[PDB]
Amino acid sequence: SKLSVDPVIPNLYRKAREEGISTVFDRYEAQQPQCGFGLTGLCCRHCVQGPCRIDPFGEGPQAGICGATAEVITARNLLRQVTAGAAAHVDHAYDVLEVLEQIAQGTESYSIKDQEKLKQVAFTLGIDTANKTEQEIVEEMCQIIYRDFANSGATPMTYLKANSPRERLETWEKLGVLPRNPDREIREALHQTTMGMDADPVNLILKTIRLGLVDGFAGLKLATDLQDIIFGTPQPVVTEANLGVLKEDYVNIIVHGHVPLLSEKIVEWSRKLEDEAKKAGAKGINLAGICCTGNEVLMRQGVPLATNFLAQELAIITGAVDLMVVDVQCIMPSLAEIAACYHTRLVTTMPIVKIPGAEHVPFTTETADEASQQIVRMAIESYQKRNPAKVYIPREKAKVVAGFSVEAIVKALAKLNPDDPLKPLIDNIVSGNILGVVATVGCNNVKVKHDWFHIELVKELIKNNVLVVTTGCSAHALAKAGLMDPAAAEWAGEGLRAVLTAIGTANDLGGPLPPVLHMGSCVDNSRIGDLVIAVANYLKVSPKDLPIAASAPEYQHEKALSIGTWAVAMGIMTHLGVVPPVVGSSKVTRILTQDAEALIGGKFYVETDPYKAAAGIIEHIKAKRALLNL
Amino acid sequence: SKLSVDPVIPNLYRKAREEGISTVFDRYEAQQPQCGFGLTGLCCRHCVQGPCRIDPFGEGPQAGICGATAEVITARNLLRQVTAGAAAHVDHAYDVLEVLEQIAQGTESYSIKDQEKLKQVAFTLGIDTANKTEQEIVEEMCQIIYRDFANSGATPMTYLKANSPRERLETWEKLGVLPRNPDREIREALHQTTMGMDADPVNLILKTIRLGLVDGFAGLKLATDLQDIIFGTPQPVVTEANLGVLKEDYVNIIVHGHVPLLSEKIVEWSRKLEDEAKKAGAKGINLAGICCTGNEVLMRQGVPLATNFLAQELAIITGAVDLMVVDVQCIMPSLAEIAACYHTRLVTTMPIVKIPGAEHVPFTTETADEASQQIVRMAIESYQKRNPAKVYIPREKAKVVAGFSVEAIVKALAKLNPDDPLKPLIDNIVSGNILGVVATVGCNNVKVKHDWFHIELVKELIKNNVLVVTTGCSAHALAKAGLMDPAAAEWAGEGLRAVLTAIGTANDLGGPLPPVLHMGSCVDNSRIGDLVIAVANYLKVSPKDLPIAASAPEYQHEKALSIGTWAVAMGIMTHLGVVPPVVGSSKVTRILTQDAEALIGGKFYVETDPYKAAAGIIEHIKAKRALLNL
Numbered sequence A, B: 001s002k003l004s005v006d007p008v009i010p011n012l013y014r015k016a017r018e019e020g021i022s023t024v025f026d027r028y029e030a031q032q033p034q035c036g037f038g039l040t041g042l043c044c045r046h047c048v049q050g051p052c053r054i055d056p057f058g059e060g061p062q063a064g065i066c067g068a069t070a071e072v073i074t075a076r077n078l079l080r081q082v083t084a085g086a087a088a089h090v091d092h093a094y095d096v097l098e099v100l101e102q103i104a105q106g107t108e109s110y111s112i113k114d115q116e117k118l119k120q121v122a123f124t125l126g127i128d129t130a131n132k133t134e135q136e137i138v139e140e141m142c143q144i145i146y147r148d149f150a151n152s153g154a155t156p157m158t159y160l161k162a163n164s165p166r167e168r169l170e171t172w173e174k175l176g177v178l179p180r181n182p183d184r185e186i187r188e189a190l191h192q193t194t195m196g197m198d199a200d201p202v203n204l205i206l207k208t209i210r211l212g213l214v215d216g217f218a219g220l221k222l223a224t225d226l227q228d229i230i231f232g233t234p235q236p237v238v239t240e241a242n243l244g245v246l247k248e249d250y251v252n253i254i255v256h257g258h259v260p261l262l263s264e265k266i267v268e269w270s271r272k273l274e275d276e277a278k279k280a281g282a283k284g285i286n287l288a289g290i291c292c293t294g295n296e297v298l299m300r301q302g303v304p305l306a307t308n309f310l311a312q313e314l315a316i317i318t319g320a321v322d323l324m325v326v327d328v329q330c331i332m333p334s335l336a337e338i339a340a341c342y343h344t345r346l347v348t349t350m351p352i353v354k355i356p357g358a359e360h361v362p363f364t365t366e367t368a369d370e371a372s373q374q375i376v377r378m379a380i381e382s383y384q385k386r387n388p389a390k391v392y393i394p395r396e397k398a399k400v401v402a403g404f405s406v407e408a409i410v411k412a413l414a415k416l417n418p419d420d421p422l423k424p425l426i427d428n429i430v431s432g433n434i435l436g437v438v439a440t441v442g443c444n445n446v447k448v449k450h451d452w453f454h455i456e457l458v459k460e461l462i463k464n465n466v467l468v469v470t471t472g473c474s475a476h477a478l479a480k481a482g483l484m485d486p487a488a489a490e491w492a493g494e495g496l497r498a499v500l501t502a503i504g505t506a507n508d509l510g511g512p513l514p515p516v517l518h519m520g521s522c523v524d525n526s527r528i529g530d531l532v533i534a535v536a537n538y539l540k541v542s543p544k545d546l547p548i549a550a551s552a553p554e555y556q557h558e559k560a561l562s563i564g565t566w567a568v569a570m571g572i573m574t575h576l577g578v579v580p581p582v583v584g585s586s587k588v589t590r591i592l593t594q595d596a597e598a599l600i601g602g603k604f605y606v607e608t609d610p611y612k613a614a615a616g617i618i619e620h621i622k623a624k625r626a627l628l629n630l
């Protein structure tokens, strides 16, 4: 029970140990104690003269072989890892961009499922949609976006300019952190982190901010916009979470990864090939999602969430996973060893991600339907070899109400006020019924008790009338904890509980809205950004003035560093539950946590205790409230 | 003595030690012993769950926290670092591309100084040279190149396809390693190295090969082409090397870095402002070059080479360096603390490379002349403040003949055979007078006795009648040792000495050709590639079959890893004199040293001893000679 607060973990972990299967919790214990030079950021291997390390306490070397000090080594490493997290989101968004162009060229595998989103995004990009066919609007949209990936001049990329408020554009301009072309910025910054380059810690951090902007607008914002257009804007849905949503009677297919280009097709063809599953001796095809692609088909298709990042291995330990299909990012390579001990088939689909011991099924837009059919047909084959003596499906599962895109939030608020939908939300923030709103994002990290920080932070926040929106694996944690159940409004403060109830009864939902609003996947952090921009514009202020905060309680991936930097660049104080590899430098840590506030509005807040973090986040919100004369 | 074979280092080191200035040799001593996990490549920090380390002897954990094994950790790290080195050369070649585009738009800072190179490259790119103007050709050339940085399709790079033999194009197509877009391949590969991505070591190395092809054709080849066009193809020159080229009576300005867009303008405006130095009480303005940018002004302006990478700090220790101007790459940040102890002014010029303590003069195309005029004037100001009591200029220097571009080599060969200029070189290879030709490239590395590996490897090679071409800091080492002196032919084998004499007097040089051919900077390693391609086509054969080999005796930068991967991609066995962070995994090391030969023809060869490496590189050529039956 010391591993996690998720109730299903101990039994599934003990079941894995009895079978001699290595889990993420065992490999961490085997690494402790971890290297102190790497944890603090005082180790450098950016050239083959290294490794070089720096003694923070003044006895060993105070510079690398090239002469890099702690302020250089730490800041240079932060820029390279933020650049890498940005490259992940950009390459993700770029993948969806290819399908949008393939829709413009007339493909039958995908289509424009949300023309309302198309007209709205096209209007944001400056496209005049009058007298234009849908195919001409998609054609012109792809041309504008590709020009960002081809821009060779000093012009800021269009997808940033069209989606950012004016005050942010002026602040980023006077700091010189505006990105011009996402691919070019990734190449320039990666060049800037090679040996014998930038030795200015401020100039490096100023470039780290620019790649956070690349990540937020060429990665998060672009992906969410195009994914809503192609697959539909999420609207409120009811379903369940945690590994109890697996069914022994059904064929169990788990989708894992990030890009819904694969998981939407698996959901489509799981429904159409369900007769073949019954002919094999099963009630149907049960679908569950792990990580962000699980959040995608949760927000659009109501597919229940299996589990988050740290417990992806234990999903197969249930013995009921017949197939797990996978694309990119956050896929533990250990799943091949774990699926080898079972009938479970692990399937990889992307050319840049292969796992020895996993069947590779090439998935392209041309072959999306036939590759999807083969994958679930492999799962129907795999269901019949299942060993019932090795299945253990936990009883724990929680009710979740998700699908809260900005479009869905406005529609729910329009029941109270049709002309000014944000006004009921803003008036209650002003009155004090809602102290502030906090975005809890990020992954799981074995250094933190699994889901423990996510849940403990949010419970302390909603108790103080602090609305919580969430994405990614932080959303999985709050989902399995029952905090997206409408019944959880009892755990929120009376001011917040009244507002949640008022919105719920005005939508004829019977009960109140849950205290935690699920706003989608990691890329759907752009929705959160779009929301606080809309709130700030309503109040005639900047997001740096809003009584808000962001938090990554258990982050692990380089994508979280980029997102955190993006939120900092957006003017939002960003809390970090895990110690970043930067604390070895006094200057860099002071810049990222104090100097950044006067520079750009936001700052990082490092706090490993959930209760200390919650108290600090609430004090930051009250400070913003006091400056707003509330 | 123990530190270096460069004769000027010990006295300059003791002079720095006397003054209390820590050098690169000092900081390397303070790091010993270095972490065994990083040295072997068995340490990962690609996520904030780390650092994860694996025992090289295989005792403790053998998988990372995410489950990544030693094969995944080393190969994933190798791809990220090769991708990092590819972004350095691509960003270099991209800066020269912007200048070429400005010439098409009518700038007065630069122009086409070698119209014949321009017309030869235009023909290679498919441009019909005749009956169109120079501005037309430049504009047509720029659009073809920017298309490569904008290609969203599966079509290979135009710059790779136009400069590759058909066998390499066919071999790379089967391996799926053809690059499409240099900027996109960096983003996609950097994405492929984040956590939870590719777990296939072979698939990761196949992408490393692709990023080597990005580095060679979108970085090395593109830079060398457009720099010859803008500044002139190098032709044979006579000059000097080593730190004896600093003169106490002159204003000594050292250019340091890699991009000749700055050093060419400094050379231009150091001559035009010569009178202001004489008015300041000086004999004139003496220019010397450190690292690759010194090689650039060496090949085109005859500027002497001051020193290479490891001894860049000791140049300021001579007390005569009045100003050191710097752009990008391989710049030790310790230079600011060392210049702070002198009148020397360190000057940074590029926005991605600033160094606290060094003055910053922003260098752009439209302000190239103005910024250059300002910079040498700063040196004239600093000269008048030079302390003569702390000046110690070594007397050692060497006679250097360089400028051996592919164009310069063939016309020196055209004197011996005007109709078929390459015939004398080919016939002496098939006869045995030249056993083969070997390229020595790369930087310095404090892990190796300074220049000891470079010189020792070349002495035995030319002794065995192996012609040697070199670039980068390997060229600096051989230049200071007098191996580019015509007298050094005496050290070459008796069979190889004859062809050197038959080329010198045939060009009315009198002195025999040096056994070492300086072919330029590290981007000028494409010249070596252009020569190998020409030689292989003359023999109707693939470069993997030529009696050739490459060597990085003392590499350190990630740019050398990229170039080494490009050489291996060119079918050339690449020797490595420094242990790469890869040996911790036997499977990955065996793929790079053995399995790669069957796939692509080339392979890496790790050998820390110069005599065993020489014997091994020599033992590799006769085997290739036997396969040709010579």
Ligand code: SF4
Pocket: A044, A045, A046, A047, A048, A049, A050, A051, A052, A064, A065, A066, A067, A068, A073, A194, A195, A196
């Ligand atoms: S860049 Fe400097 S600190 Fe980093 S590994 Fe190389 S020598 Fe060491």
Ligand code: SF4
Pocket: A035, A036, A037, A038, A039, A043, A044, A045, A051, A053, B035, B036, B037, B038, B039, B043, B044, B051, B053
């Ligand atoms: S972080 Fe650095 S010092 Fe620590 S194990 Fe890794 S290579 Fe060694």
Ligand code: SF4
Pocket: B044, B045, B046, B047, B048, B049, B050, B051, B052, B064, B065, B066, B067, B068, B073, B194, B195, B196
């Ligand atoms: S990627 Fe895997 S091996 Fe690397 S630090 Fe993260 S958990 Fe460890």
